[PDB]
Amino acid sequence: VSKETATKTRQPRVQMPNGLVLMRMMGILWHAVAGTARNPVLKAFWNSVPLKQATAALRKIKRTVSALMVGLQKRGKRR
Amino acid sequence: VSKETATKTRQPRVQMPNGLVLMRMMGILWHAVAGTARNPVLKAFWNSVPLKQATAALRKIKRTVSALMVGLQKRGKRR
């Protein structure tokens, strides 16, 4: 549920599947470095983030975002 | 100065340099879908934002952030 994902993002006890948490970790860090947001339990999990497994997601999820970006451009001109 | 940029994130009159404003657009836009925070300044910038040229610039930065993670791995084990 997208409505749920939006609520779970930046919410205490973000203990969810690895494939889901690793899809929000960098998002939070993006604003954490230059902005705000620093939850105790979040920090603990972040300090426990694997090395190789992190890069594996970095080179995967980011590609999908790029694919969709160009994908929508293919349907920019209809009719 | 991260402390200086921090208070500029999601702040009105965010007329930052090309590479700087893009970094903000690649952050707040994500939160706008997974939460909230939709400033007219960003909406206007995104409205007139390039399509084909965007993917290229974004991918360029996507590499750097991922390279940093791998770079830290080479310094995870000190002595």
From the list A38, A13, A54, the residue with the least C-alpha distance to B69 is A54
Instruction: Please name the method used to determine this structure.
Output: NMR
From the list B57, B19, B12, B58, the residue with the least C-alpha distance to B37 is B12
Q: How far apart are CA B26 and CA A53, in angstroms?
A: 23
Q: Which of B61, B68, B69 to mutate to test the interface with A (most CBs of A within 10 A)?
A: B69
Print the SS3 string covering chain A: CHHHHHHHCCCCCCCCCHHHHCCCHHHHHHHHHCCCCCCHHHHHHHCCCCCHHHHHHHHHHHHHHHHHHHHHHHCCCCC
Name the interface residues of A facing B (CB cutoff 8 Å): 5-6, 9-10, 24, 26-27, 30-31, 33-36, 51-52, 54-55, 58-59, 62, 65-66, 69-70, 73, 76
User: B-chain residues within 8 Å CB-CB of A62?
Assistant: 59, 62, 66
B43: which DSSP letter?
A: H
